[PDB]
Ligand binder design. Structure first.
Ligand SMILES: [Zn+2]
Lengths: 119, 126, 207, 19, 87
RNA sequence: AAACUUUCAACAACGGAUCUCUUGGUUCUCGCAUCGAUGAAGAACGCAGCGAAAUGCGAUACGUAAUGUGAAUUGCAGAAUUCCGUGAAUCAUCGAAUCUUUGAACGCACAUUGCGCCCCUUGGUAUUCCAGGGGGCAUGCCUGUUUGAGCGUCAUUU
RNA sequence: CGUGGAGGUCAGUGACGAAGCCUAGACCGUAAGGUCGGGUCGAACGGCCUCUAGUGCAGAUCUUGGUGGUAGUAGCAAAUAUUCAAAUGAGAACUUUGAAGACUGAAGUGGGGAAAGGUUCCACGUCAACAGCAGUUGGACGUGGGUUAGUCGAUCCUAAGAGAUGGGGAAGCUCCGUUUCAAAGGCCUGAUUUUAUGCAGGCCACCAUCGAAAGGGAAUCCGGUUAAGAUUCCGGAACCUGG
RNA sequence: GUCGAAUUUGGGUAUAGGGGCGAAAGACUAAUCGAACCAUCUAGUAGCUGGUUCCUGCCGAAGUUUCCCUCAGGAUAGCAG
RNA sequence: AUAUUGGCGAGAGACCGAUAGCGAACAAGUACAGUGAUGGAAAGAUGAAAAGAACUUUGAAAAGAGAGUGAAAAAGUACGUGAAAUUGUUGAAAGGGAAGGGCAUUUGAUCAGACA
RNA sequence: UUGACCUCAAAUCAGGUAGGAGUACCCGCUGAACUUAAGCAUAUCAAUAAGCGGAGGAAAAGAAACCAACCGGGAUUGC
């Protein structure tokens, strides 16, 4: 069988924690029956169900802390867009598009004109 | 002839892309042509083979025999029919591997996705 | 590879060991140790005179002499003494050179392009192709040279309106413009007498 | 199969006296 | 007596396992590894040992993070997720 | 005359040449710019119903989530509702996570799975002792904050 | 003349058998070689006109791989020595048991450890390979089992020495130096009853750390127990440290 | 031969290649020492040694001149195609 | 505009075809050697499909002999084709301290040609 | 006494940044010898290999204290 990720996201924080304990209890019993039977493929379903609950549990707490740091500077570093080491050190679009006040007048007064040569 | 710069005509690249193809891309490679009556009924020529399909053998030493597909064994690019087998000297029966290109589908296993695939390929779905 | 055969630290044992004084692989415990290296006669070594990329590949040809042979190859498409001896099946055709109407150049479909070649007597030469397709004798088969076939007619036009695409899929048939007139197609294999079908517009532009 | 034995040259005949 | 009697006295160890490489090249008395240079910050490498660099260059190991770097660049380093499609 | 020796042929041995194949190498051309203290490259140890290695992964361990594809995987065994469906798969894709011990490796050390300190919390009748759990404590340098030092030095008090 | 590959041609040959290989079988050429028959074989190959080269071997104490004569030859002779019966087994000079004869003679061929090895330890099953004879046996092969500590060691201390920091050198990798030209710290607390550890005095200037399983060092003994473990387990009787 | 010491020896530690160490032999420094080992420059150079792969046809030598730190080599003239 | 034996993604060859081509077409920087720096291999092919030989018999067993599978066991996990050195069996011939060769013929074996 | 100024410190102070890898190509430092000169020392190999520091997708260079002597050219780079 196995649990479904979409069925777990509709549960509260305590329901997921209580379900994780039951899956851990269920895994313990199968590890006792495993040593007395030639094969036990059922143990894979229980182990991957635990990974599903732990993923949803970690996703809910990460989403909750992402909302209390929302719309403010200095968000924690694992909730930040890594994307590269070097690209993080690169200038932002605002900083890279900065021009001095003197050259701003030259671009306004003398733009690159559009023209063609036939007549 | 080849006209695009992305298509490759190299022999060892085509063979490597065939033998090392993943399971999803081997479904398209294991395609069987439809029968004459189904081609007129549906309007399409070939479809990927599926498990619960009724098939006809038209080539090989087992030409003429027909049955229901038992398993689509993608790993060796073969397919197994339930009623064409080989009788071993000890009595045990072993399925015979067949290729879908040498087979002819006589009845299609329709569901929600095969109907959508038929309509996507210009089918009419009588 | 420039490093092929030289990726080892083989040193000569010298004389006095009752072995050849050619450098041998050092160390021990692997089997490769003590074996010869760095020689053209040694297993795993470098060959004599390794092939280099700066070998001359393209050959410079005088422009006037290049046009000299091209003009001689167009004159090879004259009376069928050279054409018959070049392998083309042109015995039952009206005349050489063959001059057809310009309406070939505006043909779009291959089927009607093929039928126009059958009417002008090229029926026999097209069946020389599609029957001589033979598997290559050499090792080039798995070097993207698997199949070998004979050469068919050369259709020459003045301006293209679809004849190139219509005859593209026909085996053995090449299309060319009067501007180019490739010598590689007019005398393939250094053999004069290619069977060439001219259009009316191409023939007058040839002058 | 053990590794190949290392080459083992000979005891190099006893030296004649050198004047 | 420099041959087989002398080899019987070999029971110490000049080199032990190195933490950084595990190749058993960590000199006990010198407290340094003769293979990777540990505990020096830079990894030991030399251009005359071109075969030695090939044994420990990038790609010879698991490549736990650089494996997925090219895939993330090809998509322009996206953030978020694909919402959903039909069928 | 046999045996023996030698030559040749047949068949059988020894051995793996030749021929025929090639998911490899090599060379050339074209396009692109993307490692790391937000923990890299590398290393160690582990993870599968039955695995040693390669490959993959990290106590969520030959994977989890998400998306696509739409019925497998396969050596055996297995599970069966997962089969006109939020769904089979050692699939593809991949934007969310996990990511042991290490390593520029960063509490101090390291031929030790050694020894601490701080904060919160739980247990043992405990602010101090012991233990469990969670989070921290490296260096150089820049900007700012706070606390200072120097008859370096200025002004002003009784 | 011959070889690998390339352009052209012979609408060349071929699963009714291509290439290769064997053939005191045949034919042609002065020769380099070419061709045919037969056998074997199973998937491609050739003639001719030109192009191209990593193009022809008996030697180089050639390279790699394989195989001979020598040759069933040299040899399997140090460490005093084995014998009888039974059992097991297809098979016993070599296994097991009993009996007899001997040796190591306690500076041992005994009982334990250190360095080192890493499962060789123990049980069951096996005898293709290994044990330079043999093998039913094995440190072999296959499948499993086994190492239990407040008191034994590591951990801690320092020795010869090693080596950061502050600094000074060196283009630099890095070198000098170890209390060194340094503003190099935490210790007993007492005040607080807003609250947790601010501030009040006095002290001490030692100034990283690493470095011994034979040095230094807090503390356990006896009996019993396993196929293989014990000063560690069980039973009894103790001791130390911290609180 | 020596056998209570200028003794023997384990572990730890220090000295590294034109350096170490040496009651001194050019000894020892991982079977390597009148300059260790490893990799690279390096396919180092050699007037010296060895080898240098199919056939047939035609022609067919020289060890002499002069010069060179030239004398086991080259240049030059001669002979030959 | 220029460079590019690295990295990523592609397209190609008058290149090499398993002693070749990168050291590595394979669990290759692997096995293994060295205290260490480093050194560093060998190793591709059954068949279309395991259909990988049920069963009988001899033997302690390995295996053999039948049977059987397959187009082919002259394809049996020592597996495509299976050369030479070398070896066994069978057949033929020769041999008084080598053998082998050249010219010529005898003898034996074997082959060929053409019927105006 | 109090409050500034200057200089120099401290903090697990608030927020950042540097290391390493790769290194085919690029920017510098450092720097040989074999070899050639039929010996050899200048020279040559070579402003190279090895060693070290620092970048990028290119780097570097770059809008003349330039070339010119002309009827004058007009940043740099490459062919
Ligand atoms: Zn190391």
């Amino acid at each position: 069988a196995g649990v479904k990720a979409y069925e777990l996201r509709t549960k509260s924080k305590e329901q997921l924690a209580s379900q994780l304990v039951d899956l851990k209890k269920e895994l313990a019993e199968l590890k006792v029956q495993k040593l007395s039977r030639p094969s036990l493929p059922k143990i894979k379903t229980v182990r991957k169900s635990i990974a599903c609950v732990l993923t949803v549990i970690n996703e809910q707490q990460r989403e909750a802390v992402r909302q209390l740091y929302k719309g403010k500077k200095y968000q924690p570093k694992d909730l930040r867009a890594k994307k590269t080491r070097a690209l993080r050190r690169a200038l932002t679009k605002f900083e890279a598009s900065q021009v001095t006040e003197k050259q701003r007048k030259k671009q306004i007064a003398f733009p690159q004109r559009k023209y063609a040569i036939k007549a | 002839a080849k006209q695009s710069l992305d298509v490759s005509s190299d022999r060892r690249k085509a063979r490597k892309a065939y033998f090392t193809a993943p399971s999803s891309q081997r479904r398209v490679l294991l395609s069987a042509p439809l029968s004459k009556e189904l081609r007129a009924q549906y309007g399409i020529k070939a479809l990927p083979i599926r498990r619960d399909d009724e098939v006809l053998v038209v080539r090989g030493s087992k030409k003429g025999q027909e049955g229901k597909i038992s398993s689509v064994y993608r790993l060796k690019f073969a397919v197994q029919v339930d009623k064409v087998t080989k009788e071993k000297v000890n009595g045990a029966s072993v399925p015979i591997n067949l290729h879908p290109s040498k087979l002819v589908i006589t009845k299609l296993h329709l569901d929600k996705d095969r109907k959508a695939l038929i309509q996507r390929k210009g089918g009419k779905l009588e | 590879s420039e490093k092929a055969g030289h990726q080892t630290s083989a040193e000569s044992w010298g004389t006095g060991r009752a072995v050849a004084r050619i450098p041998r692989v050092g160390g021990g415990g692997t089997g490769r140790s003590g074996q010869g290296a760095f020689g053209n006669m040694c297993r795993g070594g470098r060959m004599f005179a390794p092939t280099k990329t700066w070998r001359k590949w393209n050959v410079k040809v005088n422009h006037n002499e290049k046009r000299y042979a091209t003009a001689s190859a167009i004159a090879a498409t004259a009376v069928a003494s050279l054409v018959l001896a070049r392998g083309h099946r042109v015995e039952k055709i009206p005349e050489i050179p063959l001059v057809v109407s310009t309406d070939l150049e505006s043909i779009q479909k291959t089927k009607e392009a093929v039928a126009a070649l059958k009417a002008v007597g090229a029926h026999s030469d097209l069946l020389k192709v599609l029957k001589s397709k033979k598997l290559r004798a050499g090792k080039g088969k798995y070097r993207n040279r698997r199949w070998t076939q004979r050469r068919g007619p050369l259709v020459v036009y003045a301006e293209d309106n679809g004849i190139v695409k219509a005859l593209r899929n026909v085996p053995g048939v090449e299309t060319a413009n009067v501007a180019s007139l490739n010598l590689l197609q007019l005398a393939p294999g250094a053999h004069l007498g290619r069977f060439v079908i001219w259009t009316e517009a191409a023939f007058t532009k040839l002058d | 199969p053990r590794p190949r034995p290392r080459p083992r040259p000979r005891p190099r005949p006893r030296p004649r006296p050198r004047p | 007596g420099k041959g087989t009697p002398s080899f019987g006295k070999r029971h110490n160890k000049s080199h032990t396992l190195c933490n950084r490489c595990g190749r058993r090249s960590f000199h006990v008395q010198k407290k340094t590894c003769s293979s990777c240079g540990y505990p020096a910050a830079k990894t030991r490498s030399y251009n005359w040992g071109a075969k030695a660099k090939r044994r420990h260059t990038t790609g010879t190991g698991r490549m736990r993070y650089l494996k997925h770097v090219s895939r993330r660049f090809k998509n322009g380093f996206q953030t978020g997720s694909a919402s959903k499609a039909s069928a």
